[PDB]
Structure formats: C-alpha cells, structure tokens
Design a protein around this ligand. Structure first.
Ligand SMILES: Nc1ncnc2c1ncn2[C@@H]1O[C@H](COP(=O)(O)O)[C@@H](O)[C@H]1O
Ligand SMILES: Nc1ncnc2c1ncn2[C@@H]1O[C@H](COP(=O)(O)O)[C@@H](O)[C@H]1O
Ligand SMILES: [Ca+2]
Ligand SMILES: [Ca+2]
Ligand SMILES: [Ca+2]
Ligand SMILES: [Ca+2]
Ligand SMILES: [Ca+2]
Ligand SMILES: [Ca+2]
Ligand SMILES: [Ca+2]
Ligand SMILES: [Ca+2]
Ligand SMILES: [Ca+2]
Ligand SMILES: [Ca+2]
Ligand SMILES: [Ca+2]
Ligand SMILES: [Ca+2]
Ligand SMILES: [Ca+2]
Lengths: 294, 298
C-alpha cells in the first residue's frame, strides 16, 4: 500500500530564498515592508482566518535583529521573518501545533514548522559542542558561528523512523508506552543511530521494543516534526504473529496485533472499546489509516 | 519505474548492537575479559587483514573498559566488540579508510567501521553541551554524553541528506557537475535536509535550486550511512521535463544535461571518479552509483 494523503506539514514549502541568507544588504532592503511571525517559548502561535499572523516587521527595529530567522518570500515577493517573543494572552493562541495544526493552510503550516524548529535550535545551540565556546547567529539565522574559531554550526534535525508492523494480510502491531493512558496504542518509533540504514534501524527498533523480527521494510513518506527537532520517516514491515512478543528495551508496556476491522473503528472513535488512537497531525495516523482502508 | 538492484554498501548487514547491555555496566565488564577491540586513527583509518577489520584481544589496553571507548555490540558467537581512538603507525602497516576502500571490506567489518567511525568522531565533537557550555562525560558504552552540571543527556548526531536522479519517465536522466570537481565528472543532485521540510520537499527544493527544474513523483529508493563525518544519504528518483530549460541559480552546478541509458551504461563501464571519454561517474561505494546503475540497466 501507499499513503492516501500527503501528511500535514509536508505539502511542499515556500520560496525559502537560500540566495539571500548570505547577502546582509538585500535582507536589510526588504525588511522595510517585511512580514514577522512570532512564537512563544512553548512554540505557540496566533492564527486568523486559517492563516498565520504576519505582523508588519519594521515595528521592532530599523534592521533585522540577530535572534531572528529569515524564512523566505511569500507570493508577491515579500520577505517574512520569525522571532521568539512573549505572546499576548488576549488573543487566540494554539498551545500545540501538534494537536491543532489542521486549522492552518499548507503555506502557514510550512512557515510555522520551519520557524519553530529553527528557533528551538537557536535556543539549544548557543555553545559549540566541540570546544565549549559561545556561538553567534548569522546568515539570516541559518548558522551559528563559533566565537573563538569561526567554525559554523548548522541546524540539527534528528531522523526518526515510525513503523507499522503488519502480517501481510489483516493484522497489525500497535504498542503503548509505559506511562500512557490505558487503551491508547500507536506505531513504533525510534531514532536512527550512526552507522545504520533506515531499513536496519526499523528492524532494530522493532526488535528492541517488541521483540519481533521483520522483513520487507518499505518507506511510505516523511514529515517534519519540530518537537523539538525530529523528522519522521514512515515505514511498514512484515512480521509474524506466531513469534511471541518480548519487551526488552522496556519503553513498551503493552502491545498486540489488531485487525483492520478493529483499527477502522478505533480511527472513527478518536471511550468504549479496547483500542483508542491519540488525535494529532502525526504521519502515524495517516499510515494507520492508509493501511486499514487499503 | 525502478528499484535498487543491490543493497548499497555499508547497509548490507546490521550488527547485533546489543542495546540491552549499554545500560548495564556489570555485563559490559564481565564480557570484556574476552572482548574484541577495533582501533581507528584520527582520520578514521584502520588496519585490515584478509578483507576484514582487525579485532585485537581487548584486555591488552585495560583491566576494565575505558571511558573513551564505544561498545559496538556482539559478533557471531556472542563475543563483545569495542572501538577506541588511538594513534597508529602509518609506516608499520597499511591504513585503510572506508571512503576509498570500503569495497575491500566484508559486510560486517564495513558496518562495524562505519558505526565506530561516526561515533568516535561524534565524541571528539561533543565534549561540551550545546545548550549551556558545560563539559560532558561519556556513558552507557559511549552511546551518550552526560552534561556534568545538569545531568542532561546528549546523543549522537546523524544529518540526513538527499540524493536524487531526475529522469524523464523514459530513457533520459539529469546528471550534473559541481564547479569544484574535475571536468568530466558528473553525478546526481544532492543536498542536506533543512528543518521544517519533508524529504520530498527537500528533493524538489534541492533540484530546483541546483538545476532549476520542477519535479514530481519523488520516490525513495534506499538509504546508506555516510560517516564523512556524520551523514545518512537517502536516495530518490523524480520525474522532470526535458523541455523546461536548465538554470543554475544556486550556482553549485557548473554544467548539466540529459543523458540516455545507453550513454550512462557505457560511462559506468568506463569507470568511476577514480579511473578516455567526456562522461565518467563518481560513485563507487556511494548509493549514487547504485541508483544510476539501477536505472540505466532495466
Ligand atoms: N547539518 C549540516 N551539516 C553541514 N552542512 C549543512 C548542514 N545543513 C545545511 N548545510 C549546508 O550544506 C553546505 C555545506 O556543503 P558541504 O561542504 O558538502 O558540507 C552549506 O551550504 C551548508 O549551509
Ligand atoms: N538521537 C536522539 N535524539 C534525541 N533523543 C534521543 C536520541 N536517541 C535516543 N534518544 C532518547 O531515547 C528515548 C527513546 O529512544 P528510542 O527508542 O530511540 O525512541 C527518546 O525519548 C530520547 O530521550
Ligand atoms: Ca531559490
Ligand atoms: Ca492586551
Ligand atoms: Ca520509542
Ligand atoms: Ca521518537
Ligand atoms: Ca535507540
Ligand atoms: Ca535487544
Ligand atoms: Ca528503543
Ligand atoms: Ca490478540
Ligand atoms: Ca608513509
Ligand atoms: Ca546542494
Ligand atoms: Ca551532501
Ligand atoms: Ca541546504
Ligand atoms: Ca543549497
């Protein structure tokens, strides 16, 4: 099977205008009538008519500040930037783009995903991992330069796999983590280690978490996941129900095989039956859904 | 259209990484008695014997496993195996680096070395928290570094990069030459994944930047660890349109054209970047060569 829909946040991006990042002058010239998006500490943002709030940008400075991040151009040719800031409690702020991002258009969601991962990175990359030195933003916020050595540090996106193990027919593995509300299962996920391919990572993470041996590992799609800095790569793989479970790396409290039937009805639910699926914008939902209605 | 014919080098086997033991100091110490040791110089080079990475008896550097070492897992039989950085004599024995000699290694050895190489390099570049600045200390068989002030864990970094074959849906495909390569040397289009984009959007973005084409039907082919120093390469193909002219916007690309399967097959047979004619293909151990090859022979 294949994914039915492109997952939220993946539907192409903007004109990120790589060119201009290394061109301080052009940034300054376009800043006059630039746009500004603003994110609080928790990554919350404002929305209006299904669209991200874009202030007039000049109303915080003459020039673009160092702590800002240049996001690109929007249809028409107008620059757009992002800053970390407090937000006004007297607006409509979204606590989690993760749980509410379906309210936004594709463009706005792209802006926000970019802005959110970058700002979070800045907040976690003020020092070189190499020596310890302070670091300084540059190039529209797309690098941080070591203050001692001049060496560039770049935005960090950790790849993670998320997998649906199925039997090749009508059944599929879902699992629940230690502290999750009961009756709540989802796909198996794990970070890619150094020295392994995605395919090997899937097989490894599945074996660790539920003790199955899988084959026929196939990619379904991908999704930026700024919480704070993942990119999720979706897979499916064939397991064997006869092989018993085993919770070695005990991140998984409970797991079972579920029927297509069970999953379809669990998808419709969202306090009745034994399986319930958490309701987010995740590619996880799109994978489960694309399998269950093959 | 197509799938990869071969599993790309460095992906051909997974180790028994023995996740269990990393958080179990005792079991590490018990198996260290008859453990194996791989040793890498600063440049990631190692010694090999009969196409296999050299695994010393491990006790000959310690009573116990040192802090700077990295636990790689088990080998068939159940024997532990570790890796350390050390200076090695350039002159007493040949030192091989995976980048140019990975084809000479067996699959297991190549996996071990790729893991060991990316991890040790990471340690050398993660002695301080990026967050605050504090020293950091290896732990859990070297798979984390703990901040000394806060106790917060830092983890190994792998940067994803895409590499793409743009084809017309039939018999032609885009290849390009970077300004900083020799003059008859072409390959696929590549790029790092930026924050806030999916792989598919990255492919479309990087293709548009480098050669100014608009692509659709972006499909994954496979992946390959790329510890030079810390990438993972994700291979794709996409459909372009030959009638749309080229344009070298983000001028990393000096020249590019559409090539026939015929042309590419004969270019593959001539040689790669290391080895007459106007097209010659970089890629030996790269998934790039495997993608081009898998497309050109159907
Ligand atoms: N995580 C990253 N590591 C290295 N280079 C990166 C990364 N993310 C983006 N880049 C860009 O990749 C280019 C470096 O090319 P290269 O010399 O092949 O590493 C520059 O334009 C960087 O801004
Ligand atoms: N590369 C990584 N980046 C961030 N956290 C990681 C990484 N590798 C392992 N972890 C930690 O390991 C936990 C679960 O491991 P996993 O089974 O790989 O999902 C995560 O919640 C993280 O705290
Ligand atoms: Ca551009
Ligand atoms: Ca107010
Ligand atoms: Ca997990
Ligand atoms: Ca995860
Ligand atoms: Ca793991
Ligand atoms: Ca295990
Ligand atoms: Ca795990
Ligand atoms: Ca059952
Ligand atoms: Ca010499
Ligand atoms: Ca590039
Ligand atoms: Ca690259
Ligand atoms: Ca890039
Ligand atoms: Ca680029």
């Amino acid at each position: 099977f294949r994914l039915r829909n492109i997952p939220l946040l993946s539907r192409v991006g903007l004109d990120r205008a790589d060119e201009l990042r290394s061109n301080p002058e052009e940034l300054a010239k376009g800043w006059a009538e630039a746009g500004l998006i603003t994110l609080d500490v928790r990554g919350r943002v404002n929305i209006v008519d299904g669209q991200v709030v874009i202030e007039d940008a000049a109303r915080i400075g003459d020039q673009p500040p160092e702590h800002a991040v240049f996001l690109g151009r929007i249809p028409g040719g107008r620059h757009v930037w992002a800053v970390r800031a407090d937000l006004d409690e007297d607006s409509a702020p979204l606590l989690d783009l993760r749980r509410s991002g379906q309210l936004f258009d594709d463009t706005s969601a792209a802006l926000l995903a970019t802005a959110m991962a970058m700002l979070a990175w800045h907040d976690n990359a003020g020092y070189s991992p190499v020596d310890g030195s302070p670091t300084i933003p540059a190039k529209g916020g797309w690098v941080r330069v070591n203050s001692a050595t001049g060496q560039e540090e770049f935005p960090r996106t950790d790849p993670a796999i998320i997998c649906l193990v199925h039997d090749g027919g009508d059944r599929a593995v879902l699992g629940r983590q230690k502290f999750w509300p009961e009756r709540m299962f989802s796909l198996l996920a794990g970070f890619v280690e150094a020295g392994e391919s995605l395919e090997a990572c899937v097989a490894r993470e599945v074996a660790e978490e539920v003790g199955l041996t899988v084959t026929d590992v196939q990619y379904l799609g991908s999704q930026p996941w700024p919480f704070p800095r993942s990119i999720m790569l979706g897979f499916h793989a064939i397991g064997d129900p006869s092989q018993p479970f085993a919770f070695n790396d005990g991140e998984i409290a409970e797991a079972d095989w579920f029927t297509r039937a069970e999953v379809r009805s669990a998808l419709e639910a969202g306090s009745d039956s034994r399986l319930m699926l958490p309701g987010s914008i995740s590619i996880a939902r799109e994978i489960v859904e694309s399998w269950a209605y093959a």
